[PDB]
């Protein structure tokens, strides 16, 4: 079945998954999280008798439950060969470090490894990093299937899920993989439809953040908010000047979707209809704003129409059109997610929030991979250089000695080269 | 050059105009307001010593002043022939009525008649009703040049100008007409730029409400709010579902602009660039939402681009992007102007607000006029039909005995025919 399940990285995602895993019945449930303040707080909470707790918000409160953890490790040396399934709940830009850091000499019994938020090439990269003869199947879930946050870092085991996707996709490094069906069931428990696809890259090409975060949060407006310490953070999904969404950002979104689509075709995977994907799998609007015919025909509609429809879609979501109206006729301000900004870590060094550091690193790797398929991806590269220039000016102003080295530019070509070699086996 | 000036319709517009007239320099100032409760209060206020009182709000505090009314009539037949200039400050739907009611055969001293909110064809309609040989020049202003309101019907001659337009247009029935220059200076005193055009219809075709109110407030969503009794009233300039703006309504806007522009051309008037007119004459947005080259090139853009640009324009104006940002990074909610709705009058009868009643009437005339130039105007007719069917069902439900006669069907063909006859003269 799933056997004993080890969660790697015990954050908001891991707690949602733990709930769904305990509904399905796992056998033993463990977690490994690298040493640090969070791990320390987790161990204290578990030692005081706490359990993982998940709160569903609003119409999701039916999801609420508690789940028990059998073992927690903040030290890989105590791991023994007790685990059949590994679930990576760490940031996706850390998958390589995490897979290299795992004690595989002690994990020979692992037969499945699930990437909960994969990107194009993640399955191949993880496999290139496995030890020789490893025969764990690697599974790529397209995106994390919910929106979950740890409310209060002082209660590190309590998370709140505010939203749930209608549907996600799941590929496997092993053809016709039986494990996909198990995960379909596991996630069905929280209301999500899991669509199995014949290839990990087909699933990885349906990672929603690659298509949305890249054009919106790697641009000038977003980085200016993110790299700022004074003034209001702005809003991530509002129109200029309150947020980053402009016709030019929408054009970037269209042009990058075309590039990513061509890469997926060159790796043997069917691209997606971006508008139907956003509307049908993530969050819809009314037929008056987006006609069903326009959604289904998006890929054939021509660039100007395509960009008009994407803009309408994001404008139509500035509020939640299905939320209840207030006394005055207003709907919930769905678009007001403030931007998280740079902050100083415990060593005094400036650090970047995961938006956009994670989005930058995923795209840099996808671009470097695409060069092996002779694909230049100029729109992706333009968004990379926009991020690089903004961060470089922030180091200039702030001083290098003040900045965590994750702010410096990272070389994606070794990883791309390992991905491509793995692909050509 | 203005001589003695008779203001016809002593309401908010007239008070503002009176003060602008006095700043420039005029003769005696008279007013003609037809009988009614308002004229009764005016008469008492005048008997108690009242003046015309203008107050400018905030920025415009410098507009404030008082002006004496030298004469007040309610009965057109009591007018003496001591008037060189007439200014029609009544609703435009009453221009024909007013001109037909005046004893022109003993008003041979009138040299100028100014229509303050002239619709397409208004100049020609007014001239239609003048006696042969009448030598008065008819001037057409594209629209009233401020936003003005009598605060309290208790102090009937005290008005509040809360804002002043950027620019209006003025055309004259007399080619290269002198009095045009005089009125340009008079209104410039308020801060508006007045642009003389070569014919009356060139100016009449630059009324913004014809192009915006028609598609937005004659549609199904706006009428459902306007005819609504209970529930929140909604917002005139927000997107569906909080307001009437949808891709479909923007399509209506583009198509109606096409139809109006062809009518103007057949009438000898150069039409306008809708996008340029909205941005430069009404409220601008930043270059990143609407590039100047896109604004200037709008007429030549192609229908899909044009519709996208129009939608961007209204979406960009959901908040005032030039308003100061608050602590949270939000701008002023410029789009939350609630719909005014039907209400019972003095006699208990349901009345429609000026929006959309005056807009329906203006558009009905334009469509009837256009038929004489062999122009079907199907978009305009679809909007008229939507209004008529909605208002017709409201009468069905409430009962005609409960509805004011202004809600009943109208036939604008007799006025259309006279405009056309005068135009062919
Ligand atoms: N949360 C969401 O709703 C959401 C939405 C979309 C996508 N995602 C995806 O899911 C990922 C996880 O989100 P999350 O919210 O669960 O994150 P999170 O709460 O920050 O948790 C990640 C966990 O992994 C550990 N971790 C972080 N960085 C690591 C590294 N370099 N090496 C090893 N362990 C590390 C963390 O511990 P420390 O804090 O101690 O490092 C923490 O326990 C996101 O990064 C993204 O890829 C999540
Ligand atoms: N005020 C603005 O800011 C503004 C802005 C844009 C457009 N406009 C346009 O300009 C027009 C005038 O506006 P307003 O605000 O001044 O309206 P108002 O306050 O209604 O004033 C109209 C005045 O004319 C009188 N009147 C109406 N019909 C008449 C007739 N046939 N003969 C003589 N007097 C008559 C009214 O008397 P009763 O009340 O007794 O009928 C009233 O005193 C409006 O229709 C409006 O669409 C005004
Ligand atoms: N949040 C997602 C990215 C997709 N966001 C949604 C829009 C949205 C979310 N909240 C307010 N608007 C979208 O673009 O369709 C993720 O990170 O996976």
Return the HEC string of chain A.
CCCCEEEECCCHHHHHHHHHHHHHCCCCEEEECCCCHHHHHHHHHHHCCCCEEEEECHHHHHHCEEECCCEEECCHHHCCCCCCEEEECCCHHHHHHHHHHCCHHHCCCCCEEEECCCCCCHHHHHHHHCCCCCCCEEEEECCCCEEEEECCCCCCCEEEEEEECCEEEEEECCCCCCHHHHHHHHHHCCCCEEEECCCHHHHHCCCHHHHHHHHHHCCHHHHHHHCCCCCCCCECCCECCCCCECHHHHHHHHHHHHHHHHHHHHCCCCCCCHHHHHHHHHCCCCCCCCCHHHHHCHHHCCHHHHHHHHHHHHHHCCCCCCCCCCCCCCCCCCCCCECCCCEECCCCCEECCHHHHHHHHHHHHHHHHHHHCCCCCHHHHHHHHHHHHHHHHHHHHHCHHHECHHHCCCCCHHHHHHHHHHHHC
Residue B366's closest CA among B173, B218, B195, B246? B218
Kind of pairing, strands A137-141 and A146-150?
Answer: unpaired
Task: Please list every protein residue whose CB sits less than 6 Å from any atom of ligand 1.
Answer: A 9-13, 33-34, 36, 38-39, 89-92, 94, 97-98, 117, 144, 147-148, 150, 354, 358
Q: Are B146 and B40 in contact (CB under 8 A)?
A: no
Ligand with the closest atom to the CA of A17: 1
Query: Among A222, A216, A191, A337, which Cα is nearest to A278's?
Result: A216
Work out the minimum CA distance from B225 to partner chain A, whole angstroms. Answer: 11
**Quick check: is A60 catalytic?**
no
Q: Do B311 and A316 touch (CB under 8 A)?
A: no
**Separation of alpha carbons A209 and A186, rounded Å:** 23
Contact between B240 and A315 using a beta-carbon 8 Å cutoff? no
How many beta carbons lie within 10 A of that of residue A36, not counting itself? Answer: 11
User: Which residues touch B47 (CB under 8 Å, ≥6 apart)?
Assistant: none
CB–CB of B274/B259 below 8 Å? no
Q: Which residues contact A174 (CB under 8 A, 6 or more apart)?
A: A137
**Angle, alpha carbons B79-B85-B88 (nearest 5°):** 80
Of all protein residues, whose CA lies closest to atom 3 belonging to ligand 3?
Answer: A209
With 0-12 CB in 10 A as exposed, 13-18 as middle and 19+ as buried, what is A81?
exposed
Residue ranges of alpha helices (H) inside B53-191 are 95-101, 122-128, 178-188
- Write B56-62 long-range contacts (CB < 8 A, 24+): B56/B161, B57/B160, B57/B161, B57/B162, B57/B163, B58/B162, B60/B161, B60/B162, B60/B163, B60/B164, B60/B191
Query: To 10 degrees, the CA torsion angle through B308, B311, B317, B321?
Result: -10
Residues of B labelled catalytic: 213
Closest Cβ opposite residue B304 in set A231, A304, A319: A304
Rounded distance between C-alpha atoms, residue A55 and residue B82, angstroms: 81
How many Cβ atoms sit within 10 Å of the Cβ of residue A126?
Answer: 26
**Elucidated via:** X-ray
DSSP summary character for residue B207: -
Which chain B residue lies closest to A235 (C-alpha atoms)?
Answer: B329
Helix axes B354-371 and B247-266, enclosed angle (nearest 10): 50
Q: Which of B232, B328, B329 sits opposite A325 (nearest CB)?
A: B232
Which one is catalytic: A213, A286, A331, A404? Answer: A213
A282 Cβ below 6 A of ligand 3: yes
Structure tokens at A164: 């749930």
| Residue B310 near residue B302, CB atoms below 8 Å | no
Resolution stated for this PDB structure, in Å: 2.2
Closest CA to B161 of B151, B147, B150, B172: B147
B329–A231: do the CB atoms touch at under 8 Å? yes
**CA A52, A57, A59 angle in degrees (round to 5)?**
130
Of residues B12, B268, B269, the one with CA closest to residue B148: B12
Residues of chain B found within 8 Å of residue A328, distances taken between Cβ atoms: 232, 338
Q: What is the dihedral of CA B278, B284, B288, B291, to 10 degrees?
A: 40
Interface touch A239/B304, C-beta < 8 Å: no
* Closest ligand 3 atom, residue A212 Cα: 14
Protein residue with least CA distance to atom 27, ligand 2 = B90
* Helices B274-281 and B208-217: angle between axes, nearest 10 degrees: 110
The label of the residue with tokens 């090409």 reads A205
- The Cα–Cα gap between A275 and A66 comes to 36
Contact A232 B318 (CB under 8 A): no
Report the alpha-carbon distance of residue A259 to residue A263 in Å, rounded.
Answer: 6
Among candidates A231, A242, A328 on the partner chain, residue whose Cβ is nearest the Cβ of B319: A242
Token pair recorded at residue B133: 């040989």
């Amino acid at each position: 079945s799933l056997g004993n399940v080890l969660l790697v990285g015990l954050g908001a995602v891991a707690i949602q998954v733990a709930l769904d895993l305990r509904r399905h019945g796992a056998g033993r449930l463990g977690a490994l999280n690298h040493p640090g303040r969070r791990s320390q707080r987790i161990a204290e909470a578990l030692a005081r008798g706490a359990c993982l707790q998940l709160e569903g918000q609003g119409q999701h409160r039916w999801l609420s439950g508690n789940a028990a953890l059998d073992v927690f490790h903040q030290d890989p040396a105590e791991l023994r060969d007790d685990w059949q399934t590994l679930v990576l709940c760490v940031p996706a830009d850390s998958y390589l470090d995490v897979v290299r850091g795992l004690p595989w000499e002690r994990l020979g019994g692992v037969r499945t490894l699930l990437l909960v938020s994969a990107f194009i090439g993640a399955n191949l990269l993880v496999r290139s990093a496995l030890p020789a003869g490893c025969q764990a199947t690697v599974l790529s879930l397209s995106s994390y299937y919910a929106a979950t946050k740890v409310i209060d870092e002082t209660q590190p085991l309590r998370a709140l899920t505010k939203a749930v996707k209608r549907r996600v996709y799941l590929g496997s490094s092993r053809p016709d993989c039986p494990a996909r069906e198990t995960w379909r069931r596991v996630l069905a428990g929280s209301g999500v439809e899991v669509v199995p696809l014949a290839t990990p890259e087909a699933a990885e090409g349906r990672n929603v953040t690659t298509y949305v975060h890249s054009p919106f949060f790697l641009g000038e407006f977003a980085l200016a908010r993110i790299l700022s310490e004074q003034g209001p953070p702005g809003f991530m999904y509002k129109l200029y000047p309150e947020g980053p969404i402009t016709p030019g950002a929408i054009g970037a979104m269209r042009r990058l979707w075309c590039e990513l689509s061509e890469l997926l075709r060159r790796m043997g995977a069917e691209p997606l209809n971006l508008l139907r994907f956003l509307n049908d799998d993530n969050y819809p609007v009314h037929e008056t704003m987006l006609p069903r015919a326009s959604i289904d025909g998006f890929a054939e509609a021509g660039a100007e129409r395509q960009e008009y429809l994407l803009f309408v879609r994001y404008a139509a979501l500035l509020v939640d059109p299905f939320s209840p109206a207030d006394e005055q006729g207003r709907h919930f301000d769905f678009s007001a997610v403030p931007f998280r900004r740079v902050s100083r870590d415990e060593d005094g060094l400036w650090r970047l929030p995961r938006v956009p550091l994670e989005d930058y690193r995923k795209l840099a790797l996808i671009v470097a991979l695409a060069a092996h398929f002779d694909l230049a991806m100029p729109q992706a590269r333009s968004l990379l250089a926009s991020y690089e220039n903004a961060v470089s000016r922030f180091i200039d102003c702030q001083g290098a000695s003040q900045c965590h080295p994750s702010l410096y530019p990272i070389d994606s070509r070794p990883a791309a080269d390992a991905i491509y070699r793995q692909w050509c086996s």
